[PDB]
RNA sequence: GAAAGCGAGUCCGAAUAGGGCGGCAUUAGUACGUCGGGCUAGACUCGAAACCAGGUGAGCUAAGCAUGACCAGGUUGAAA
């Protein structure tokens, strides 16, 4: 499976479809505008 | 990180000392080739004494069995 990690900092609206993400990765996509969709 | 796992953080720990990593001030790989070296094969070439497998030999020699052959001449003089 995939994973999102907080390294880049430009801020933009993005909708991510990863299988998991780090605390500061989710709390970075939302703060910049956008949703992170993790399955059931 | 032993792992679960967490993630530019993570591991010991009960939070503060530190290991390893990131940013590093910071630069990049991958495929094929030729060459250096490594590993694995007989591994630069040549050489054992030996160990193991299957077979060949008793026409030599050691013996055994079957059936044949051989021992001039002279001396001594047992029992009965």
UniProtKB/Swiss-Prot annotation:
Highest rank taxon of the organism: Bacteria
Keywords: Ribonucleoprotein, Ribosomal protein, RNA-binding, rRNA-binding
GO cellular component: cytosolic large ribosomal subunit
Keyword rRNA-binding: yes
GO molecular function: rRNA binding; structural constituent of ribosome
GO terms for biological process, alphabetical: translation
Function in brief: Binds to the 23S rRNA.
Complex and partners: Part of the 50S ribosomal subunit. Contacts proteins L4, L21 and L35.
Family statement drawn from the similarity comment of this UniProt entry: Belongs to the universal ribosomal protein uL15 family.
Name assigned to this protein: Large ribosomal subunit protein uL15
Span within the parent record: 105 to 144 of 156
């Amino acid at each position: 499976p995939v994973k999102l990690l907080a390294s880049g900092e430009i801020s933009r609206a993005v909708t991510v479809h990863v299988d998991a993400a780090s605390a500061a990765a989710i709390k970075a996509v939302e703060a910049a505008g956008g949703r992170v969709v993790l399955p059931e």
